[PDB]
Motif scaffolding. Structure first.
Motif, PDB file in Angstrom:
ATOM      1  N   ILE A 153       0.847  -1.176   0.000  1.00 18.02           N
ATOM      2  CA  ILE A 153       0.000   0.000   0.000  1.00 18.02           C
ATOM      3  C   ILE A 153       0.903   1.255   0.000  1.00 18.02           C
ATOM      4  O   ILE A 153       0.683   2.218  -0.752  1.00 18.02           O
ATOM      5  N   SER A 154       1.941   1.196   0.814  1.00 16.28           N
ATOM      6  CA  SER A 154       2.942   2.295   0.835  1.00 16.28           C
ATOM      7  C   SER A 154       3.539   2.581  -0.519  1.00 16.28           C
ATOM      8  O   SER A 154       3.648   3.769  -0.952  1.00 16.28           O
ATOM      9  N   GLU A 155       4.016   1.544  -1.189  1.00 16.64           N
ATOM     10  CA  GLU A 155       4.531   1.711  -2.532  1.00 16.64           C
ATOM     11  C   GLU A 155       3.486   2.233  -3.531  1.00 16.64           C
ATOM     12  O   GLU A 155       3.826   3.007  -4.419  1.00 16.64           O
ATOM     13  N   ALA A 156       2.223   1.808  -3.375  1.00 21.95           N
ATOM     14  CA  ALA A 156       1.134   2.307  -4.208  1.00 21.95           C
ATOM     15  C   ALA A 156       0.899   3.821  -4.005  1.00 21.95           C
ATOM     16  O   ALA A 156       0.677   4.526  -4.954  1.00 21.95           O
ATOM     17  N   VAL A 157       0.926   4.250  -2.758  1.00 23.36           N
ATOM     18  CA  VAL A 157       0.819   5.654  -2.407  1.00 23.36           C
ATOM     19  C   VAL A 157       1.986   6.420  -3.022  1.00 23.36           C
ATOM     20  O   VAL A 157       1.792   7.443  -3.640  1.00 23.36           O
ATOM     21  N   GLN A 158       3.195   5.919  -2.832  1.00 23.33           N
ATOM     22  CA  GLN A 158       4.355   6.584  -3.407  1.00 23.33           C
ATOM     23  C   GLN A 158       4.165   6.817  -4.917  1.00 23.33           C
ATOM     24  O   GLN A 158       4.398   7.921  -5.408  1.00 23.33           O
ATOM     25  N   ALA A 159       3.736   5.797  -5.662  1.00 25.56           N
ATOM     26  CA  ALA A 159       3.538   5.924  -7.107  1.00 25.56           C
ATOM     27  C   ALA A 159       2.407   6.872  -7.490  1.00 25.56           C
ATOM     28  O   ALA A 159       2.488   7.616  -8.459  1.00 25.56           O
ATOM     29  N   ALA A 160       1.340   6.825  -6.715  1.00 27.25           N
ATOM     30  CA  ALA A 160       0.143   7.612  -7.015  1.00 27.25           C
ATOM     31  C   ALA A 160       0.437   9.070  -6.770  1.00 27.25           C
ATOM     32  O   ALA A 160       0.138   9.923  -7.620  1.00 27.25           O
ATOM     33  N   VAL A 161       1.031   9.351  -5.610  1.00 29.48           N
ATOM     34  CA  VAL A 161       1.327  10.735  -5.231  1.00 29.48           C
ATOM     35  C   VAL A 161       2.359  11.336  -6.170  1.00 29.48           C
ATOM     36  O   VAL A 161       2.158  12.442  -6.689  1.00 29.48           O
ATOM     37  N   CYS A 162       3.441  10.610  -6.416  1.00 26.64           N
ATOM     38  CA  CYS A 162       4.406  11.086  -7.376  1.00 26.64           C
ATOM     39  C   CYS A 162       3.816  11.219  -8.771  1.00 26.64           C
ATOM     40  O   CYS A 162       4.203  12.102  -9.515  1.00 26.64           O
ATOM     41  N   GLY A 163       2.895  10.339  -9.133  1.00 23.96           N
ATOM     42  CA  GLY A 163       2.248  10.425 -10.431  1.00 23.96           C
ATOM     43  C   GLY A 163       1.383  11.664 -10.618  1.00 23.96           C
ATOM     44  O   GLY A 163       1.297  12.203 -11.725  1.00 23.96           O
ATOM     45  N   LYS A 164       0.771  12.131  -9.535  1.00 29.88           N
ATOM     46  CA  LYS A 164      -0.148  13.249  -9.605  1.00 29.88           C
ATOM     47  C   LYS A 164       0.512  14.577  -9.392  1.00 29.88           C
ATOM     48  O   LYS A 164       0.036  15.575  -9.900  1.00 29.88           O
ATOM     49  N   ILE A 165       1.572  14.588  -8.589  1.00 31.85           N
ATOM     50  CA  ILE A 165       2.258  15.824  -8.196  1.00 31.85           C
ATOM     51  C   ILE A 165       3.712  15.759  -8.690  1.00 31.85           C
ATOM     52  O   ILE A 165       4.615  15.238  -8.011  1.00 31.85           O
TER      53      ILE A 165
END
Lengths: 7, 81, 81, 7
Positions: free
Chosen positions: C55-67
């Motif tokens: 889940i942590s890695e998913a957050v990292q990718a999502a947040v970096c993907g959006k911002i």
């Protein structure tokens, strides 16, 4: 204006 | 220029709205620290005028919802494909 | 301050990832025009350590993907509820 | 550093 802003 | 980043966000937000077949045109400008923008979206030529108006309003809400600095956004629709 | 707007985006991006039970902590800083940030997310206490890592890695990718200005983001997970 | 950045 808006149209004027759009340049 | 940090305007490119904002323009990308607008395009990507519009494109996630059901019935949008791409962003045909987008002009954005700063008025102080606010953004004023004018957009044309593509829609299915067989949608009704009323449906195209609905999709336009959906784009307006979505884009303004995601990009908080936008204080004026006009959206119009044209047939695409 | 335009940092608040960026922090809102990070929180809202993290919260849309499956398995995130809120953002416990977020510290963001500018390093030039890049953002470096450290985050703690809440997760189900009954998830495995391995799931929490996912889940942590998913957050990292999502947040970096959006911002796109984020150039370093550490995400850790803690039990919540 | 990263930890130093976090202030």
């Amino acid at each position: 204006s808006f149209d004027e802003v759009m340049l």
